[PDB]
Point group: D3
């Protein structure tokens, strides 16, 4: 059973992954790093799920890493010389990066719905998601320099590739200052702001349901190629897209869409097969 998160079926095709340690403001304890990997690897193979919503139980999205677990992991490493310590740490860092890379490698769209603070590992988490919504009281903080380290589980790799303003990204990173909702929306880190958590969740789940109404081949192939396209040249990415759609265009999802158009039936009334 997951002890640090809770996964529920919100509605057809939609999975809700909720950070669930509210008494610690969803701090990321050691086991969370394994649990979120297990969770998203399962979601990736689940043929019924078409979209994911991520939120936090309690008063805020996440306070970030569990500082005592961090201290045990990093300040008490095994190894009888510095090279052997580094060998251990490289494996540790690589394993913790996987906690948020599984979100990006999940072909289903993942929607983060943030309320209150989203601190430290929270920003690494949400920058690996596809769509980000927040509440008016939310705030974001690349807290790691205040802990004595450069963020290593995805923020520096992905945050600069989800918004345009690099001066702001650098200021947030080097100072660890909070960015409140108004500025988060202005920056584009979030694409919508809601007055409270209930209204935001309603909108997040309505978005996930709308995505789930569409062909899953088209939606999940879109995510896959948006991610490929971020990291490769336009020409390399067009070449990959032709190699991708030479099989994916051979789908009944297009046949059904064309049949609907000919019959003058809205596309939301089509049923697509599992993926």
């Amino acid at each position: 059973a997951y002890e640090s998160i809770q996964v529920t079926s919100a509605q057809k095709h939609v999975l809700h992954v909720q950070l669930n340690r509210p008494e610690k403001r969803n701090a990321m304890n050691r086991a969370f790093w394994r649990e979120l990997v297990e969770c998203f690897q399962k979601i990736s193979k689940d043929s019924d799920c078409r979209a994911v919503v991520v939120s936090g139980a309690g008063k805020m999205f996440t306070s970030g890493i569990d500082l005592m677990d961090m201290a045990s992991d990093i300040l008490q490493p095994p190894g009888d010389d510095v090279a052997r310590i580094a060998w251990y740490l490289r494996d540790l860092i690589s394993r913790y990066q996987k906690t948020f890379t599984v979100i990006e490698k999940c072909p289903k769209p993942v929607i983060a719905a943030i309320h209150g603070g989203c601190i430290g590992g929270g920003v690494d988490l949400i920058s690996a998601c596809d769509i980000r919504y927040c509440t008016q009281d939310a705030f974001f903080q690349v807290k790691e320099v205040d802990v004595g380290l450069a963020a290593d589980v995805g923020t520096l790799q992905r945050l600069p590739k989800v918004i345009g303003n690099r001066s702001l990204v650098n200021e947030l990173t080097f100072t660890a200052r909070k960015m409140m909702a108004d500025e988060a929306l202005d920056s584009g880190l979030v694409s919508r702001v809601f007055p409270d958590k209930d209204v935001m969740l309603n909108a997040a789940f309505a978005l996930a349901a709308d995505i789930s109404s569409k062909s899953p081949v088209a939606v999940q192939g879109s995510k896959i190629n948006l991610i490929y396209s971020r990291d490769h040249s336009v020409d390399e990415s067009l070449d990959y897209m032709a190699t991708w759609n030479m099989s994916m265009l051979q789908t009944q999802d297009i046949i059904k869409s064309v049949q609907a158009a000919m019959e003058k039936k809205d596309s939301k009334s089509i049923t697509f097969s599992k993926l």
Copy 2:
């Protein structure tokens, strides 16, 4: 004598490429994919053209792909097994991507001037242009998921590389929702919004004239290197730029400009040779 587009000389150095099937809302049919390649390949070799404006005839920029021409192209493919159908489809996708890659590979700046809807293939087109202007009634839609396929002619590869907000790009792509002019300006997809098509085209042709008054070596070398720099690291791009300008700095265009500066002569009075 094109079937789907019309190319005219607007004014000195400026070509106007107009999508021209107004009775069919400029739907992109079979000939369109071949003709835009022919058109921009000729523009690229045209030593008198320094800038291009692209617009649509009739009520809207484009309704996108012609669905029954698409059904013919994709739903009745030749091939006696899936691998052979995929062979055919890979070639088709590759050819149709070239329709918009030729805009990027044309060294002259290309300005898209959108009025009304710009749907599906329309967003693949405008995201391959350099500068985008639109009217107050314009709207943009990454419609492909509603037809059962991930966009494959450029939107996924270029759209996220022309605006900063990746949460918004992902929402647009997975939902196929319309983005209206105000939001398109806010996102930076378009540079300027105008009240109506006439005012927009006046400003687009004024922008094209202004660009055409500049050294063509400087302007077209700037487009070539901005594109190279998007796809390569800064250090690789600086190395390429040094190899580029070791030839291109050997021009009378600079000597003329330094001489004008020395005499206190406006740089707008200088005439530059063809390119």
Copy 3:
């Protein structure tokens, strides 16, 4: 020491690099291209410096390149044939690019504080800095096309990688038009605008002091990995980050920062060792 710049110790750990030819509007003459390289190479090895502020003396940040020196270097080149001229120009361009590349390769965060005009070479300089602030009267101009050349000392390689709106980047580059402070803030080129130079400098120095109060290992490792991550895929950048932090997490800065957090003390109360 220097002919074209002046370097002062503003406050603990902060260096102020001031363009210092106010009677010539801080034009970038031959000495400037050599001196900035010497300066930032020394700052990169200075174990007491943790942050840098760059500003200009007099009326404006910079009028840009000295055209007379440029013509001597570029319109009067050694070389008895075009290939031999190009061999010399390749090296010249490479050396002038280094003037601004040393700002990016300097591990300390560099804050540009712009007042009045920032023209041509000034945009190449500020787009190699990390954080950009300006005054209400500032303006920015990618002036190179008006001189007859595509900008080659950094703007084309870095400006599109510091802001999201590529339509604006292309319009600024191809027309060489001025972008004023309100639009610079809107575009994200600058992340803060101030009423005057004094207020701006007070905030830039306060920002530099805040940054300098943090672990230098964490801040400088953050800059190094933000730059690496811009130019590589997310997966390559995560791999690099694990190989980086397998040594950099082995620091007393974590114990010190965590202890301070436990006692509710600020970063400024901690003494981190030199770097």
Copy 4:
């Protein structure tokens, strides 16, 4: 009705492309650069061809570029300044590189069968082919430095990627010395050496027939992925291969081969559909 080459059907599925200006030792003149592009573009779309053999008519494979056609192309270029001459030359070089890039971009295996000298442009040609055979009297020469230029139509990009010994490649390139058949076999530039042209062409057409007896999906997908794998990391190349074979494994070519294996039927008796 080519002026510089001749294309014939050797036998089922095999095309023979012969350099055909024997009175001028198959010198590569102006029409040759255009015609080899036309020829291989047609071969690439020819669903009956599965393999190609390239040879030269007359006394030798090729003497290389036609020097007085080269003088015309390069020494009398249009352009009223150096930058404009370079614009013209970049386009020329790019077009002439396509003459040999089309061989690599053709998915059918291309076998070069060299007798006598293979000089300058000859090495750019054969290094773009997949398999190389030669006669005992054959010789290879990277002659370009003796004409005053670094080879630009493929040798420098491909030759070091078809043999292992980089010291030898560098010596050949900087000295322009001839490499004879024995050394060409030892270096691995050629796979097999034959006593005379007739024996070599028999073996080249036997090799082409053998390749043509195999599944064309398997053979041409193997060439496409060997080329992709040369230019990308192993992990990027494995990812591309999975995206390629998720379509291409859906073929009757495998079902037929497993069925033959089940019955104990030679795999040489199977017939495969066109591609």
Copy 5:
């Protein structure tokens, strides 16, 4: 433990991974693809192992993939349309690639000791190992085209990156012909040939023991950086190497190795800590 392989501790620090279905000529059935991944993932974390030897039990190294299992997995796929079939096959191919990729990602050197036939999947396996030895009766065959598919589990991505002669690589791939031991040695595919399996194994184990007598930090860091350097530019690889050795040079293995050199003692006389 395993159904298709057997793992034994040969001698101190050396593990022997033996393909172990001798009655079936070590055919690679469904279990094998899972088991090799489990095996090398465990060896990668085994702090006592420093080198691995891979061999096959019975008459031959391996006959390659089990065709019946392959047909079940590949000619009988789940999926109600071609796109959904491809979605499943992409994952299948990706998982089978991991079977051999874990050998490359294992930081310990892996020595392949081949006797008799090494067919199809066997070449994919040995081209992911580091050092290859064979017997006089061994032979190698890139058999996949004879099954109707382009090899997808590593040969095309790694074989051309382990030997220099690309004409030979292409001939072997397109014809599926056998390459015997003398030619395998000549090509560099194997670096040593032995008269029989016993003599070969004695030398492979002696090599593994020699390797294991060296600092494991130095040897495993050497493999990691040889692999990184294959896939990146020399400049990127040098940068990575400096970021790697800034931790790995901080080891007692240097003091120990240098002290032994000063006393004229061999590596085997030193005790290096586990890794």
Copy 6:
């Protein structure tokens, strides 16, 4: 004055760089790492030099690093915590890599002429050279694992990219065993073997003179593009080659070569201008 090397003018256009600490078998002391950088940076800018020969004074090419200097550099590093030690070591490693990278970044061809042992840093040196010749008594040794470290100054980055046999490269690296001349020639690491040092040097200088007789624009542009081509795809490298030769074909070196051919004068009688 260089204390660890000696540079002489061997003959017109040829520079001889000789390792010159023969009483220590040319061991690489601390200052050598700076001296070779100063030396090749000067040679790179020297317009009279067209080729370089590198050899060692005394009984052998080089015994490799000075072990006591290594111990002082690496085993006595400054820094009050492991991260600050790593900061120092990264800068040290980067600086020592430059010692051999300057050889590759020198546009003139560099010929290594090895006699006796070429140990440790000797292999990093010669693998950065372009052409390698040796004597019958020579031997090569990737000695670093015997010292407790993975080679970091170029061998792992370049050795695998100068020869084809990766199994041999891995065996040499992991065991640190010697490779004698016969095997070095067979591998292709050297391209010629001579009976003794005098005969080898005569041949090295005759090769350097032959290279120096050719156009320096063609020779040095060839080196530059061979190196670019090793590290980039063929398509990227052809694009760079067109951008390179759009200026370099505009040389009198080609005019003179064509005039010689028309006059029936051998090309070795042409005089080319300095570069």
